[PDB]
Write a protein that binds this DNA or RNA. Structure first.
Ligand SMILES: [Mg+2]
Ligand SMILES: [Mg+2]
Ligand SMILES: [Mg+2]
Ligand SMILES: [Mg+2]
Lengths: 559, 49, 49
DNA sequence: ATACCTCTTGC
DNA sequence: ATACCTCTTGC
DNA sequence: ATACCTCTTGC
DNA sequence: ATACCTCTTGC
C-alpha cells in the first residue's frame, strides 16, 4: 500500500529526475527560396508506449499453413516461411502519413513539380518507466532507476525491414499515442510446392525441406550494435542523415505511343460545330507519305506509323514464379488506369493498401476489418490487354482468323487464358516512370538491393537510396528482475512487470520546386468540397480518418 | 572488433557486457568450515573419491 | 604472394612460370577452310548438332 | 544570340 | 646476396 | 552525432 | 525570450 518512496533528483546540464529533456514539435515548415525552390521541413513527434517483451529470448520459428495449400488450387495461399524473433522492437517511421497532414499534402501537390528528399534525423526523450503491482487494484509506480534500451543500427548490419509494408509504422496522429513493433526477420529455408487446380488428381508435392546450412545467418542486436541505456534523465539522439537519391516528380505523363510526334496533316476540316463533325486526313491510307517499321505494306496509319520508341511495356499476369523458397507474384511497374477501368477493371500493377485505425481507418469505427483502397496512378503508362493482338507477317488484310492471335483465343487449350497472360514486351526501347508516392500510406524511402545488377526502380517507394540508408532504430525494455533468479535454472525468468513511455521526435527534410503555368487551360488540382468535406474533420466524438490522395496531378509533355 | 594492420597483424578487441544479479549473502560472516566425506572413502578401493 | 595491408586489404601477387614447347607449323600458310557436318544435321531432329 | 514547359544556361 | 613455412631480417 | 554487415564515412 | 495563420519581428 506504499508510493515506493519518491526519489530525489540530482542535476546535470542535459538532464535529471524532474527535468524534461525534450521539446514537442510536430509542425511543418515551408521555406521559400530564390528561384522557386522550397525547403520543406517536417517535424513530427509522438508519444510512444512500449511493454516488456514476452520473453527475453531470440527464437527461431517456422510457420506452416500446409493445410490451407493442401487444398489444390490454393497455391497463392501459401504462407510458409522461417523467421527469427527478437525481443526487440522496431521504431519505424518511414511513411507519408507520419509526416504530413492533408493540408500539407495539398499544398505540395498542387504547387510543386518535383520533390527531393534531403535529410532526416530523430531523437528520443522524456523517458519514463513504471511498474505495475497488484482485490484487483492495479497500482503503478515509477521505477526511477530502471532503464530503457536503445540501439541504432547505423551500420545497417541488420536485414532491412521496412514496416510500412505491413502497416506498422507509427501512427499518423500527433495527438494520439502509438507504438513500435516487435522486431523479427526472415530466416532462411528451402521449400517446394507444385501448383495445381480444382480438377487436379492426388497430392502435388508440397513440402518444407529445411535449411541450407550455407544460406544461414543469425544476427543479434547485442552482438552488433551498441546499446544505450537511458534512465529518465537520459535522452538520446541520432545525428542527421543525408540522402543520396533521385528526385520524384509530381507530374504525370499522358501521351502513349499514339501521341508522339507530328500528327498527320488534315486536308479536310470541319465547317461547323458539333461532336460529329470530324476532320479528314484525306489521303488513301496506302498512299500517304511517311515512315514505318513495317517492310511489307504501304499502309500508314496512326497505328502503323513509326514511333521513336515505346512507352510502357507488357508483362505476364497474374504471374507466379518460384525459386528456392516458394512461389511469389511477379511484379509489374506500370499498373493500368484510365477510362476503361474505374477500380473495377482494377488489375495488375495497381497497388492496394490495407490498414488499421493507427493509419487511417476511422478511429471510431468498430470491428476489426481493415480499410482499404487501390491506388490508381494518373500516369497513363499501363496496358489494356484486351486491346492487344498479334498477326501474321504477311499482313494481308482485313485479316483471317488463321493469321491472328487474340486476347480471345485460348492458349494451351485453357479457356480463361490468352497470350496476353504470358506475354512480355519489355525491351531496349521501353521507357517509363517511377511509381508515384502514395499518401498517406506509402513508404517513403527504401534500401537498394545488394545485387550486382539492379532494378531500375522499386515499387514500394519512390525514393531508393543509392548508398546506405538510415539505420534502423530499436528499442526495448531492460529486464527488471525480482530477487529470485537462477540463470542456472531451466525455467523462464520472472521479471517485474515493467513498461515504458517516451517521446519521439523526428525531422525530415525535403526540397522541392514550385511549378509554373504553361498551358492556357488550367489544370487539375486537389481541393475540398461538399463531398469529401467530412473526411477532413473529426466527428462529434473525435472520430478521425485519413483518406488517401493522389500525387502526380499535373501533366507534362513526354515528348 | 577485428582491426587489420600492416603485415597481417590483427588487433582483436572483444567487448562484452552482462547484466549481473546478486543477492545479499547468507550471513555477514567469515566461516571456517571442514568438509568430511570420510564415509565414502571409508569404503576401501574408493581412494579417488 | 599475399601481402597484407592496412584496413584489411590484400595484395595478391601471383607468379607463374612454365616451360613451353612448340613445333614448327604444318605449313607456313594462312588457309581459309570451311567445315561441313551437313550429314550429321541432315538427320532431322539433330539441329543442335 | 536556342538550353531540358516562364522570367533565366540569367545573374 | 640464406633469416625462423610468402611478399619481407623488406622498407 | 546514422554511412554501404566491425573497429572506421575513423584518422 | 509572444509580433500580424510557418520557418522568421529570423538573418
Ligand atoms: Mg559509427
Ligand atoms: Mg562501418
Ligand atoms: Mg548448399
Ligand atoms: Mg541455398
Amino acid at each position: 500500500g506504499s508510493g515506493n518512496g519518491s526519489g530525489g533528483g540530482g542535476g546535470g546540464g542535459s538532464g535529471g529526475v524532474g527535468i524534461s529533456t525534450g521539446t514537442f514539435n510536430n509542425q511543418t515548415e515551408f521555406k521559400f527560396l530564390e528561384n522557386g525552390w522550397v525547403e520543406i521541413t517536417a517535424n513530427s513527434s509522438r508519444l510512444v508506449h512500449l511493454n516488456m517483451p514476452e520473453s527475453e529470448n531470440y527464437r527461431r520459428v517456422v510457420v506452416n499453413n500446409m493445410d490451407k495449400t493442401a487444398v489444390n488450387g490454393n497455391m497463392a495461399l501459401d504462407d510458409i516461411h522461417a523467421q527469427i524473433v527478437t525481443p526487440w522492437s522496431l521504431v519505424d517511421a518511414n511513411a507519408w502519413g507520419v509526416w504530413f497532414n492533408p493540408g500539407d499534402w495539398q499544398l505540395i501537390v498542387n504547387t510543386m513539380s518535383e520533390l527531393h528528399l534531403v535529410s532526416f534525423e530523430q531523437e528520443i526523450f522524456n523517458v519514463v518507466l513504471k511498474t505495475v503491482s497488484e482485490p484487483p487494484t492495479k497500482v503503478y509506480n515509477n521505477d526511477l532507476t530502471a532503464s530503457l534500451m536503445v540501439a541504432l543500427d547505423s551500420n545497417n548490419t541488420m536485414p532491412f525491414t521496412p514496416a510500412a509494408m505491413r502497416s506498422e509504422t507509427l501512427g499518423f496522429y500527433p495527438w494520439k499515442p502509438t507504438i513500435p513493433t516487435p522486431w523479427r526477420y526472415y530466416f532462411q529455408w528451402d521449400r517446394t510446392l507444385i501448383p495445381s487446380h480444382t480438377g487436379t488428381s492426388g497430392t502435388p508435392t508440397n513440402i518444407y525441406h529445411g535449411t541450407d546450412p550455407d544460406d544461414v545467418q543469425f544476427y543479434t542486436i547485442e552482438n552488433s550494435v551498441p546499446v544505450h541505456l537511458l534512465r529518465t534523465g537520459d535522452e538520446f539522439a541520432t545525428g542527421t542523415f543525408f540522402f543520396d537519391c533521385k528526385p520524384c516528380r509530381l507530374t504525370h505523363t499522358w501521351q502513349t505511343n499514339r501521341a508522339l510526334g507530328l500528327p498527320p496533316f488534315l486536308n479536310s476540316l470541319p465547317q461547323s460545330e458539333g461532336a460529329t463533325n470530324f476532320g479528314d486526313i484525306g489521303v488513301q491510307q496506302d498512299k500517304r507519305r511517311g515512315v514505318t517499321q513495317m517492310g511489307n505494306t504501304n499502309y500508314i496509319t496512326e497505328a502503323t506509323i513509326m514511333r521513336p520508341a515505346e512507352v510502357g511495356y507488357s508483362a505476364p499476369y497474374y504471374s507466379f514464379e518460384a525459386s528456392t523458397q516458394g512461389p511469389f507474384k511477379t511484379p509489374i511497374a506500370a499498373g493500368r488506369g484510365g477510362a476503361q477501368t474505374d477500380e473495377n477493371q482494377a488489375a495488375d500493377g495497381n497497388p492496394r493498401y490495407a490498414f488499421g485505425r493507427q493509419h487511417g481507418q476511422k478511429t471510431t469505427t468498430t470491428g476489426e476489418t481493415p480499410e482499404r483502397f487501390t491506388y490508381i496512378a494518373h500516369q497513363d503508362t499501363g496496358r489494356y490487354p484486351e486491346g492487344d493482338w498479334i498477326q501474321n507477317i504477311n499482313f494481308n488484310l482485313p485479316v483471317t482468323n488463321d493469321n491472328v492471335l487474340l486476347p480471345t483465343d485460348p492458349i494451351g487449350g485453357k479457356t480463361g487464358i490468352n497470350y496476353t497472360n504470358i506475354f512480355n514486351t519489355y525491351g531496349p526501347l521501353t521507357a517509363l516512370n517511377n511509381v508515384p508516392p502514395v499518401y498517406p500510406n506509402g513508404q517513403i524511402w527504401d534500401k537498394e538491393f545488394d545485387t550486382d545488377l539492379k532494378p531500375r526502380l522499386h515499387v514500394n517507394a519512390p525514393f531508393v537510396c543509392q548508398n546506405n540508408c538510415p539505420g534502423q532504430l530499436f528499442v526495448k525494455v531492460a529486464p527488471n528482475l525480482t530477487n529470485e533468479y537462477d540463470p542456472d535454472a531451466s525455467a523462464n525468468m520472472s521479471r517485474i512487470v515493467t513498461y515504458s513511455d517516451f517521446w519521439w521526435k523526428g525531422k525530415l527534410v525535403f526540397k522541392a520546386k514550385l511549378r509554373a503555368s504553361h498551358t492556357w487551360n488550367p489544370i487539375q488540382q486537389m481541393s475540398i468540397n461538399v463531398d469529401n468535406q467530412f473526411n477532413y474533420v473529426p466527428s462529434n466524438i473525435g472520430g478521425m480518418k485519413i483518406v488517401y490522395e493522389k500525387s502526380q496531378l499535373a501533366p507534362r509533355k513526354l515528348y
